[PDB]
Design an enzyme around this catalytic site. Structure first.
Site, PDB file in Angstrom:
ATOM      1  N   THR A   1       0.825  -1.203   0.000  1.00 45.39           N
ATOM      2  CA  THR A   1       0.000   0.000   0.000  1.00 45.39           C
ATOM      3  C   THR A   1       0.862   1.257   0.000  1.00 45.39           C
ATOM      4  OG1 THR A   1      -0.177  -0.193   2.407  1.00 45.39           O
ATOM      5  CG2 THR A   1      -1.974  -1.107   1.082  1.00 45.39           C
TER       6      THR A   1
ATOM      7  N   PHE B   1      -8.068   5.105   4.436  1.00 41.25           N
ATOM      8  CA  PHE B   1      -7.614   4.197   5.481  1.00 41.25           C
ATOM      9  C   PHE B   1      -8.768   3.455   6.151  1.00 41.25           C
ATOM     10  CE2 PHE B   1      -4.382   7.433   4.990  1.00 41.25           C
ATOM     11  CZ  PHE B   1      -3.205   6.704   4.982  1.00 41.25           C
TER      12      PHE B   1
ATOM     13  N   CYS C   1      -7.340   1.457   9.427  1.00 44.19           N
ATOM     14  CA  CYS C   1      -5.926   1.120   9.319  1.00 44.19           C
ATOM     15  C   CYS C   1      -5.175   1.484  10.594  1.00 44.19           C
ATOM     16  CB  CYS C   1      -5.302   1.830   8.125  1.00 44.19           C
ATOM     17  SG  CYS C   1      -3.529   1.553   8.015  1.00 44.19           S
TER      18      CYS C   1
HETATM   19  C1  HEM Z   1      -0.772   4.270   2.056  1.00 49.13           C
HETATM   20  C2  HEM Z   1      -0.694   3.384   3.057  1.00 49.13           C
HETATM   21  C3  HEM Z   1      -1.865   2.502   3.566  1.00 49.13           C
HETATM   22  C4  HEM Z   1      -3.150   2.453   3.161  1.00 49.13           C
HETATM   23  C5  HEM Z   1      -3.851   3.277   2.056  1.00 49.13           C
HETATM   24  C6  HEM Z   1      -3.836   1.456   3.960  1.00 49.13           C
HETATM   25  C7  HEM Z   1      -5.169   1.108   3.853  1.00 49.13           C
HETATM   26  C8  HEM Z   1      -5.880   0.322   4.737  1.00 49.13           C
HETATM   27  C9  HEM Z   1      -7.309   0.075   4.720  1.00 49.13           C
HETATM   28  C10 HEM Z   1      -8.319   0.642   3.702  1.00 49.13           C
HETATM   29  C11 HEM Z   1      -7.606  -0.733   5.740  1.00 49.13           C
HETATM   30  C12 HEM Z   1      -9.018  -1.253   6.083  1.00 49.13           C
HETATM   31  C13 HEM Z   1      -9.213  -2.608   5.410  1.00 49.13           C
HETATM   32  C14 HEM Z   1     -10.637  -3.080   5.562  1.00 49.13           C
HETATM   33  O1  HEM Z   1     -11.486  -2.303   6.073  1.00 49.13           O
HETATM   34  O2  HEM Z   1     -10.924  -4.239   5.168  1.00 49.13           O
HETATM   35  C15 HEM Z   1      -6.377  -1.037   6.450  1.00 49.13           C
HETATM   36  C16 HEM Z   1      -6.239  -1.838   7.567  1.00 49.13           C
HETATM   37  C17 HEM Z   1      -5.043  -2.250   8.126  1.00 49.13           C
HETATM   38  N1  HEM Z   1      -3.785  -1.771   7.801  1.00 49.13           N
HETATM   39 FE1  HEM Z   1      -3.316  -0.536   6.220  1.00 49.13          FE
HETATM   40  N2  HEM Z   1      -2.923   0.918   4.846  1.00 49.13           N
HETATM   41  C18 HEM Z   1      -1.703   1.533   4.633  1.00 49.13           C
HETATM   42  C19 HEM Z   1      -0.534   1.272   5.322  1.00 49.13           C
HETATM   43  C20 HEM Z   1      -0.375   0.360   6.346  1.00 49.13           C
HETATM   44  C21 HEM Z   1       0.826   0.134   7.125  1.00 49.13           C
HETATM   45  C22 HEM Z   1       2.174   0.870   6.964  1.00 49.13           C
HETATM   46  C23 HEM Z   1       0.582  -0.831   8.014  1.00 49.13           C
HETATM   47  C24 HEM Z   1       1.641  -1.340   9.022  1.00 49.13           C
HETATM   48  C25 HEM Z   1       1.384  -2.283   9.933  1.00 49.13           C
HETATM   49  C26 HEM Z   1      -0.799  -1.264   7.840  1.00 49.13           C
HETATM   50  C27 HEM Z   1      -1.483  -2.240   8.545  1.00 49.13           C
HETATM   51  C28 HEM Z   1      -2.851  -2.436   8.575  1.00 49.13           C
HETATM   52  C29 HEM Z   1      -3.569  -3.373   9.419  1.00 49.13           C
HETATM   53  C30 HEM Z   1      -2.933  -4.335  10.448  1.00 49.13           C
HETATM   54  C31 HEM Z   1      -4.875  -3.262   9.151  1.00 49.13           C
HETATM   55  C32 HEM Z   1      -6.014  -4.069   9.817  1.00 49.13           C
HETATM   56  C33 HEM Z   1      -6.426  -3.405  11.128  1.00 49.13           C
HETATM   57  C34 HEM Z   1      -7.600  -4.135  11.732  1.00 49.13           C
HETATM   58  O3  HEM Z   1      -8.414  -4.714  10.966  1.00 49.13           O
HETATM   59  O4  HEM Z   1      -7.719  -4.146  12.986  1.00 49.13           O
HETATM   60  N3  HEM Z   1      -1.340  -0.511   6.812  1.00 49.13           N
HETATM   61  N4  HEM Z   1      -5.348  -0.375   5.804  1.00 49.13           N
END
Ligand code: HEM
Ligand SMILES: C[As](C)(=O)[O-]
Length: 446
Positions: free
Chosen positions: A257, A387, A394
């Site tokens: 991402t 996010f 996120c």
């Molecule tokens: C431009 C950077 C990023 C974008 C656009 C992004 C986008 C997203 C989105 C849309 C979700 C929600 C997914 C859903 O609702 O099914 C999410 C969840 C998550 N992201 Fe990212 N993310 C980015 C960077 C990162 C980074 C650097 C990490 C480092 C650990 C990360 C870890 C996670 C985790 C663990 C979740 C799940 C949280 C949960 O469900 O409790 N993401 N992200």
């Protein structure tokens, strides 16, 4: 009105399909029909935390073969999502970011040094691949204090290669899945069994080595907290198998991402000259001279315009193009139309919502000044959730926004961007949106 839509790129096809509807519809894309929501008023009803919640979508369900019950692919009911979420939240706050800042900035320095040699040799750089090697090292070194690749080198670690083969094997559709792969022991199923054990063995070694290390005089990182902090409610820590899942989760969910978002921002900076000038002026005023910037933690958030560049990139092309939601109860969205039984799931199309007509008549243009607080207050009903939303939004948003600015600030400060003549922006769809065939060339700014 009849329309012929090509769903080779699914999300880009749903967006074109959505313009002949009024914000919600059905569509068969591959192995399923999905209720797609791309309207501003409808989406914000879907994002209501009391009535709706996160749905583990089809692809997320297929990623459980790799990441298991990690925070990204775990169901809401699984006890390992709530435990990990209440354990790893302190490791992702703004305070926790300052602990990582030095290691993040040092890793960017390693990439800039490698890109110096490529600028000297007048070489065309494949931007998405290079940025993906970087964000991998950023998460692993800052989060787990582990190094997989040397950015100056071009040999690929065996572990990261196995994870990519394991991601491809997970997305395999039921038709491409042989009916008896569990039994014949073909080369592919056998390679997957070997890759799965090799991946689990490497993350176990990272866990075991740290367990021997008392880490005297050092602030705990992500791996330390997973080995130290117990869940306040249940009193237990994350078991070994789940810790290995979180490491795999942060590696795959955080690297691709952030890397593709940087690649998009590099394209738009190399294409629109006025934006590149205003951003290069903001990073020149912060760190004068052409010596590598002495990045201090507080300076990153002070780069207002560079933050607006990343925001507009995440709007025009959200690398996470959407998320799946499910109904906690029998409810209705809109105006009483569209009823949903509990556990019915829909897809929020962020790419369509971010480029929706409610963003003004110039929604298809890259204009960073649009993403200011004043310019967005003049819009009304509009969606901008790159996010996600809710308690399962996120966890690494503050981590991603920190690393994306330092990476772009260093590149704009050290190099100038030459795009490829005749190239035009094509976006492929993997687990994320990615610029395809994106090549840039750099000269040291001297
Ligand atoms: C431009 C950077 C990023 C974008 C656009 C992004 C986008 C997203 C989105 C849309 C979700 C929600 C997914 C859903 O609702 O099914 C999410 C969840 C998550 N992201 Fe990212 N993310 C980015 C960077 C990162 C980074 C650097 C990490 C480092 C650990 C990360 C870890 C996670 C985790 C663990 C979740 C799940 C949280 C949960 O469900 O409790 N993401 N992200
Ligand atoms: C299967 As569930 C309702 O915990 O996302």
């Amino acid at each position: 009105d009849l329309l012929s839509v090509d769903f080779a790129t699914p999300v880009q096809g749903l967006t074109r399909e959505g313009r002949r509807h009024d914000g919600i519809f059905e569509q068969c894309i591959g192995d399923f029909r999905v209720v797609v929501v791309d309207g501003p008023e409808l989406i914000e009803e879907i994002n209501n935390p009391q009535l709706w919640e996160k749905n583990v979508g089809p692809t997320l369900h297929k990623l459980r073969s790799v990441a298991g019950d990690g925070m990204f692919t775990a169901y809401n009911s699984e006890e390992n999502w709530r435990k990990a979420h209440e354990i790893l939240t302190p490791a992702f706050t703004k305070e926790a970011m300052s602990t990582y800042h030095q290691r993040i900035a040092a890793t960017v320095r390693e990439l800039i040094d490698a890109w110096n040699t490529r600028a000297q040799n007048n070489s065309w750089i494949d931007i998405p691949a290079e940025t993906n090697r970087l964000t991998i090292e950023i998460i692993s070194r800052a989060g787990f204090d582990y190094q997989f690749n040397n950015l100056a080198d071009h040999s690929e670690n065996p572990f990261i290669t196995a994870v990519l083969r394991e991601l491809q094997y997970a997305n395999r559709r039921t038709d491409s899945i042989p009916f008896y792969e569990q039994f014949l022991g073909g080369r592919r199923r056998r390679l997957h069994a070997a890759d799965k054990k090799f991946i689990r063995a490497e993350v176990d070694k990272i866990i075991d080595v740290r367990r021997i290390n008392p880490r005297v005089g050092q602030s705990p990182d992500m791996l330390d907290i997973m080995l130290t902090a117990a869940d306040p409610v249940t009193g237990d820590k994350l078991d070994n198998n789940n810790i290995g899942n979180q490491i795999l989760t942060f590696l795959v969910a955080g690297s691709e991402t952030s890397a593709n978002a940087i690649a998009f921002a590099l394209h738009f900076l190399a294409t629109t000259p006025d934006v590149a000038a205003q951003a290069r002026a903001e990073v020149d005023a912060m760190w004068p001279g052409r010596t590598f910037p002495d990045f201090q933690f507080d300076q990153i958030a002070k780069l207002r315009y560079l933050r607006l560049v990343i925001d507009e990139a995440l709007r025009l092309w959200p690398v996470a193009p959407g998320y799946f939601r499910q109904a906690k109860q029998d409810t209705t969205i809109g105006e009483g139309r569209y009823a949903f039984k509990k556990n019915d799931w829909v897809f929020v199309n962020l790419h369509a919502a971010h480029t929706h007509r409610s963003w003004g008549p110039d929604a298809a243009e890259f204009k960073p000044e649009r993403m200011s607080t004043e310019n967005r207050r003049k819009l009304g009903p509009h969606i901008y959730k790159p996010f996600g939303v809710g308690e399962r939004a996120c966890i690494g948003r503050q981590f991603a926004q920190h690393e994306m600015v330092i990476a772009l600030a260093a590149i704009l400060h050290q190099f100038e961007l030459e795009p490829r003549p005749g190239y035009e922006l094509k976006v492929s769809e993997t687990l994320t949106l990615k610029p395809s065939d994106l090549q840039l060339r750099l000269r040291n700014r001297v």
